[PDB]
Design a protein around this nucleic acid. Structure first.
Lengths: 94, 103, 77, 46, 62
RNA sequence: UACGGUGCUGAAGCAACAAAUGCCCUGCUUCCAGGAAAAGCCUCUAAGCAUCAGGUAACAUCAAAUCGUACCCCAAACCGA
RNA sequence: CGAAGGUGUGCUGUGAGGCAUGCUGGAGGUAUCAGAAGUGCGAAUGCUGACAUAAGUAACGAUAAAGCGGGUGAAAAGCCCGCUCGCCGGAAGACCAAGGGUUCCUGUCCAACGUUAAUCGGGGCAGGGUGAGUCGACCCCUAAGGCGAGGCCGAAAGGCGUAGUCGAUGGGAAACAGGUUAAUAUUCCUGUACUUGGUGUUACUGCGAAGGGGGGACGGAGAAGGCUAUGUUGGCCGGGCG
RNA sequence: UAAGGUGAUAUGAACCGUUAUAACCGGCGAUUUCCGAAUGGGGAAACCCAGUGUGUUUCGACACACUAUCAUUAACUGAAUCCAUAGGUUAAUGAGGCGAACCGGGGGAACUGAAACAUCUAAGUACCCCGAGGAAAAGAAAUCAACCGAGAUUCCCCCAGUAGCGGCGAGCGAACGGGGAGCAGCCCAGAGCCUGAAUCAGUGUGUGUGUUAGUGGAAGCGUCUGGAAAGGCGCGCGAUACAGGGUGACAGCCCCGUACACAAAAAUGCACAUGCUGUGAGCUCGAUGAGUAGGGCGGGACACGUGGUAUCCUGUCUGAAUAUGGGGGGACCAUCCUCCAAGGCUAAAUACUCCUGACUGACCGAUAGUGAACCAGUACCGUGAGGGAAAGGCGAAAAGAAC
């Protein structure tokens, strides 16, 4: 049982990319940005409540942040958690 | 306790536009005002496709030091200095010369 | 640590002076000894690591006293 | 030619890492020294 | 808004807090997309929540 | 046919011989220089509990979190400026 | 109506020097008489920066090797495509660990970096990319060893060490084949599996550990025999008739 | 406190706000991830893994609290072993770690000098360790003095480079006494009377005065040069304000300020004033710090190197008297003088500055001044401890050069 507030705080954003689009169209899998602390079950619960849609499963991964250079100064981007959430057959998401 | 404000008419004490007059357009935190029509520069504006800017020699208003301007007293027909005083539990500006409140 | 429990005698530093007065640092250890002391009031032996001087003190005063002071000092025995 | 530095992360951490420094007095002093200096990287710890 | 929200019960307060959070989330979802063209809203709402949180702490044990 | 590829389709698909340093082999034979540990695993009971729990029996359901996963890796990416 | 500073000129003092003035420069300078010194540089294989010389000299990092056509381009010996040639092939191929930490893929740019050129790049900029119940870590167990309640010892700091607790390089449950991305895959998809926990069940009925026992649990060399990986030939199937 | 704001490189976007919950400043609160003494256990810091309990569940799980060690005290329990004790489980209180210098204590070099070198010096320095405070330490005569007297401690100037010490070398180096700063004395070794008597700490209240935001705060125009006037030349005015900074060149009168006069809802320092809690003052009788003082042996400290060596400390072995007594007066004795050890407390004058504010400089002005005027303890180097740079200036204004 996950608290509603925590659920709301889990999901950061949808991830738009060619691979993501492909996953959406073919495998019925949405690619989300989520809280780095968010576990799989949590993510799933939040999906179910906040997008109102059945989940088969969640795969997660951690994206490491790129090192960049603004002018002369070096600086690193934040790491962030990606989640492939596979949605039950026939589940159409807005 | 700022003697010159957004919508005051001022007169210039110094510079190329000295003696001229104009309404303050806005005042900057740096201690500079921009006044209408006074300090003009012909900036060469670089065109940009986005934001619908064509690009040309735009004559705009550059800032001026507050010290360099002075609040104009219409009655005297002259520049005056500003003092502060409490009228009915409320601070108000006034003209040092002729001691009348700014309204 | 080589410390008389009754008296508090620690080692102290000093010198070996030779006939040619060649100072070399040395220690002076007290004459410590672990001794069972019969405590007549409680009816048991109390072991104490303690100097010959401490012994003499105990003899003079009474072990019970010594134990009390030590207790006051916040020392186990 | 086998040169002197033959890196190994675990070995590095155990030898020089934060906890190792913490464990003993002298290491703690080293840490304090480095803090005083203003070191950004207090220890080898990544 | 704090003075207005101070005149409420705990249960009330909690509901609004939830309502603020849901909004927040919606805005975040919009923001990631190209929908939200009003950025200040996010700032507002976050502040609103913090205010509520404060008002809950004051009520409960202060 | 965006000359990158994509979609459809698809025969036969057996036999013999040879054959490891791999497997049987943590085996067997032999030698002296005489060849980890602990848990998992099996089993025995004690205190206990006692007609409850626990055990094994199948069947149902739920569960398996977290972190790593790119790329180089006898090297232009590691140790050698 | 042009300070210091810079740079010429003229005059002047026995000298260190001084005065005036042209140009540059664009805001400070300072008589006199006193006062105080980070007060005077050619050397110290002095220090720091800049710039010379050798000199457009040596070299351009394995003697595995290139040639042509087409493309793009401002420009092609070097990039892409093609056909030849040549080199490695118990490696100069393929997969990992360690170590590195985005170098991966795509687009774009060629100042610098690349011992030349560069349209190319492990270079610049932007975007994308790492999907696990069964792989590995984590986790359970311990070795060498480490820490170590109490404890023993020690001027202090501290040393050793019991109970313990950590410590892999060793022991401990479970997944295979095919397909797919520009870039991941025993992780995605397709198919077909397995594991060990709970919970609930009906069925039964002695369960229970910090303890006992078994097991795990183990050397070198040698010898075969049985196998497979794999390869060869034949058969088969498809294509061919130079 | 306000008419402007949403920190900076750094614009823009989307917005807020203008007489008062915009922004900004100050008091008191709230939140305060993980690591770190780190403290539930573990660990390769910022990670891994728990237990218990209380609540919730859409029954898949959630939440939140507690769980370190030691010391001390209390409760319960509890061996060999009868009682006990050790031990064990709980509970409460405190500690732990960090931090510039200064301070007290425990340990303690060598280079060097002696023109070598060993005593000696360097030096109780460097350093390591423990502990404390805003200061510390010391401190209320078993002290000096000299037959006159002084009257706790600390610090400064003299005494004096004297007396001494010293391979009588190199060197070390007092004291008495005088002048100052500052000055404070108390309690227990114990019982009687009287009973709340001075003082101190914590803690409320009141007053005063700071501190932490702030408010007001004087008086100038013309003309010439000039890109620009604050400069020149005229004529004015303020000044308890001609400190300083800025403004298109040098400004008392343009701006910010300055002198001067005022200001605090809230928090808080210090003085007194006062309430409460603890504490006991004054009077009489006493009592008057034993393994101690001294001594032998060995060291150390005293300017004093064992010397003719007083005095102090004690590792070691001894060991009094106890006020009709004892200590000291620089070997020792006698006389006289002077003090009362073997229990404690104690402000001031003194030491320092990681840090805060204000002001000053015959201090530097980018190879100087901090290593660091600049995103520097950074880049870079090193396994690590550690080392450790370079690098400031367009313009008045970006008007930073459309085409």
């Amino acid at each position: 049982m996950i608290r509603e507030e925590r659920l709301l705080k889990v999901l950061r954003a949808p991830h738009v990319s060619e691979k993501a689009s492909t996953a959406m169209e073919k495998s019925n899998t949405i690619v989300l940005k989520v809280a780095k602390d968010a576990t799989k079950a949590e993510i799933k619960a939040a999906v179910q409540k906040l997008f109102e849609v059945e989940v088969e499963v969640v795969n997660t991964l951690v994206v490491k942040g790129k090192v960049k250079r603004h002018g002369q100064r070096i600086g690193r981007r934040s790491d962030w958690k990606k989640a492939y959430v596979t949605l039950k057959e026939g589940q159409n998401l807005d | 306790a700022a003697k010159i404000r957004r919508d005051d008419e001022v007169i210039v004490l110094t510079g190329k536009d000295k003696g001229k007059r104009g309404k303050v357009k806005n005042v900057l935190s740096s201690g500079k005002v921009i006044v209408e029509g006074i300090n003009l520069v012909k900036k060469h504006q670089k065109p940009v496709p986005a934001l619908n800017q064509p690009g040309g020699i735009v004559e705009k208003e550059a800032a001026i030091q507050v010290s360099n301007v002075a609040i104009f007293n219409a009655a005297t027909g002259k520049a005056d200095r500003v003092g502060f005083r409490f009228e009915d539990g409320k601070k108000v500006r006034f003209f040092k010369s002729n001691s009348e409140t700014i309204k | 640590s080589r410390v008389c429990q009754v008296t508090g005698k620690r080692p102290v530093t000093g010198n070996n002076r030779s006939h040619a007065l060649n100072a070399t640092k040395r220690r002076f250890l007290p004459n410590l000894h672990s001794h069972r002391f019969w405590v007549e009031s409680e009816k048991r032996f109390v072991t104490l690591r303690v100097s010959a001087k401490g012994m003499r003190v105990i003899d003079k005063k009474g072990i019970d006293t010594v134990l009390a002071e030590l207790r006051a000092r916040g020392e186990k025995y | 030619m086998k040169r002197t530095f033959q890196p190994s992360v675990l070995k590095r951490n155990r030898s020089h890492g934060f906890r190792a420094r913490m464990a003993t007095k002298n290491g703690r002093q080293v840490l304090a020294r480095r803090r005083a200096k203003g070191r950004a990287r207090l220890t080898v710890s990544k | 808004k704090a003075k207005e929200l101070r005149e409420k019960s705990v249960e009330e307060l909690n509901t609004e807090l939830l309502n603020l959070l849901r909004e927040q989330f919606n805005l975040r979802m919009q923001a990631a997309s190209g929908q939200l063209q009003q950025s200040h809203l996010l700032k507002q709402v976050r502040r609103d929540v913090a205010r509520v949180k404060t008002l809950l702490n004051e009520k409960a044990g202060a």
